[PDB]
Design a protein around this motif. Structure first.
Motif, mmCIF file in Angstrom:
data_model
loop_
_atom_site.group_PDB
_atom_site.id
_atom_site.type_symbol
_atom_site.label_atom_id
_atom_site.label_comp_id
_atom_site.label_asym_id
_atom_site.label_seq_id
_atom_site.Cartn_x
_atom_site.Cartn_y
_atom_site.Cartn_z
ATOM 1 N N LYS A 72 0.834 -1.241 0.000
ATOM 2 C CA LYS A 72 0.000 0.000 0.000
ATOM 3 C C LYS A 72 0.852 1.269 0.000
ATOM 4 N N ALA A 88 -0.070 7.200 -1.590
ATOM 5 C CA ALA A 88 -1.289 7.777 -2.162
ATOM 6 C C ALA A 88 -2.550 7.135 -1.585
ATOM 7 N N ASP A 89 -2.562 5.805 -1.532
ATOM 8 C CA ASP A 89 -3.706 5.051 -1.015
ATOM 9 C C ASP A 89 -3.973 5.337 0.464
ATOM 10 N N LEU A 118 -2.924 8.031 2.211
ATOM 11 C CA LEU A 118 -3.306 9.441 2.351
ATOM 12 C C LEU A 118 -4.755 9.684 1.927
ATOM 13 N N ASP A 119 -5.219 8.926 0.934
ATOM 14 C CA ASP A 119 -6.623 8.947 0.521
ATOM 15 C C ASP A 119 -7.533 8.648 1.716
ATOM 16 N N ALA A 120 -7.159 7.638 2.496
ATOM 17 C CA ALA A 120 -7.924 7.239 3.674
ATOM 18 C C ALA A 120 -7.907 8.306 4.770
ATOM 19 N N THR A 121 -6.758 8.951 4.966
ATOM 20 C CA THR A 121 -6.599 9.942 6.037
ATOM 21 C C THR A 121 -7.434 11.201 5.809
ATOM 22 N N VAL A 122 -7.374 11.750 4.597
ATOM 23 C CA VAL A 122 -8.157 12.951 4.264
ATOM 24 C C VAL A 122 -9.663 12.699 4.346
ATOM 25 N N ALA A 123 -10.082 11.476 4.031
ATOM 26 C CA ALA A 123 -11.491 11.087 4.115
ATOM 27 C C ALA A 123 -12.042 11.236 5.533
ATOM 28 N N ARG A 124 -11.291 10.745 6.518
ATOM 29 C CA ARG A 124 -11.710 10.823 7.923
ATOM 30 C C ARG A 124 -11.779 12.269 8.410
ATOM 31 N N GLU A 147 -12.271 14.886 6.065
ATOM 32 C CA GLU A 147 -13.364 15.370 5.206
ATOM 33 C C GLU A 147 -14.759 15.100 5.775
#
Lengths: 291, 47
Positions: free
Chosen positions: A1, A4-5, A7-13, A15
């Motif tokens: 992983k 990018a993958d 960091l995608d998860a981190t910004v979602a939480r 957001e």
């Protein structure tokens, strides 16, 4: 992983909890945009606790909310002034709304410009007839309730209730035990919020204990020492002004409303401008500096 | 409403008139005056 993958998860939480869940004000308009976004207005049947140390402006903030509620809504707002006399408060609201230095009303000369603004202010308040102030001191929950009910029956419901700090209220039967006394007051105010289906803003003091800390911004935990207020409360707002604690600070004329708890939605801080001269809060103009 | 509005302006000089006729106009001015002063204060202490 890869990076990018993850960091995608981190910004979602971030957001998810960042955005507000309400489109438009369901509750009563506070008159402050950043606060309206965070609360969606002061919701019916919500016990709202405005708590702060002395000299933060907790009373004037709560009074600004009622002043704004009176202008942006036609149904009546009820104020229980346990601390000050009715007229002493109303003179302060004239200064607040008309934005005239309060000292000039008390002692100094009032300008022709100043006189005009308060004349307009008073005319509008006389037009609306939304503001009902009760200066009776040492009221019981039953007295507060029956009086609020009387206003609700004789006029078109109730828009907002305002209690000049909660600790001035009392219950004879429980007067011997202060923790029980406050527990009943908080419970009754919540019950009252439901019956009339109205937001009730109840102010509260904070004990000195918190000032032994380095970071002197109030935390929710500072209400369990007061009593069972934190449990009953649906929305808790603390007022903090760095200026009073620190001689020189990055922000000088800035205050900040810290939402400690909210059933309705998100926790967070909302920064406002504060004026000691006419005792009123304003929205912060951070969005657009433009040199 | 009538007689109370009379005494209101006996305190002032004769040439003054009300700056606002509605609450919406007052809050329009409130935001205006607040917006510009909040920016001014912010400008000064940063500078």
């Amino acid at each position: 992983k890869n990076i990018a993958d993850v960091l995608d998860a981190t910004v979602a939480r971030i957001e998810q909890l960042f955005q507000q869940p309400h489109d438009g004000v369901t509750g009563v308009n506070t008159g402050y945009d950043d606060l309206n976004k965070k609360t969606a207005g002061l919701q019916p049947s919500d016990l709202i606790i405005v708590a702060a140390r002395p000299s933060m402006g907790k009373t004037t903030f709560a009074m600004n909310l009622v002043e704004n509620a009176a202008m942006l809504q036609d149904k009546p707002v009820l104020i229980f002034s346990l601390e000050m006399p009715s007229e002493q408060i109303m003179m302060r609201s004239l200064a607040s709304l008309s934005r005239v230095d309060q000292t000039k009303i008390r002692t100094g000369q009032l300008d022709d410009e100043d006189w005009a603004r308060i004349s307009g202010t008073m005319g509008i308040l006389l037009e609306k007839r939304n503001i009902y102030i009760d200066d009776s001191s040492g009221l019981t929950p039953t007295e507060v309730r029956s009086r609020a009910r009387r206003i609700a029956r004789e006029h078109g419901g109730i828009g907002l209730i305002m209690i000049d700090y909660l600790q001035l209220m009392r219950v004879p039967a429980l007067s011997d035990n202060r923790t029980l006394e406050i527990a009943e007051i908080s419970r009754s105010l919540k019950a009252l919020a439901k019956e009339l289906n109205v937001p009730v803003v109840a102010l509260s003091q904070l004990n000195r204990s918190l000032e032994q800390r380095a970071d002197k911004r109030p935390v929710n935990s500072d209400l369990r020492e007061s009593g069972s207020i934190e449990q009953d409360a649906d929305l808790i707002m603390f007022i903090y002004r760095d200026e009073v604690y620190h001689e020189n600070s990055d922000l000088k004329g800035i205050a900040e409303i810290i939402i400690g708890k909210q059933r309705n939605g998100p926790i967070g801080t909302v920064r406002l401008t504060f004026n000691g001269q006419w005792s009123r809060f304003d929205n912060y103009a951070g969005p657009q500096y433009d040199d | 409403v009538g007689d109370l509005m009379q005494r209101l302006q006996k305190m002032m000089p004769a040439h003054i008139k009300p700056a606002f006729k509605t609450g919406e106009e007052l809050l329009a001015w409130q935001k205006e005056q607040g917006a510009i002063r909040s920016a001014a204060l912010e400008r000064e202490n940063r500078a």
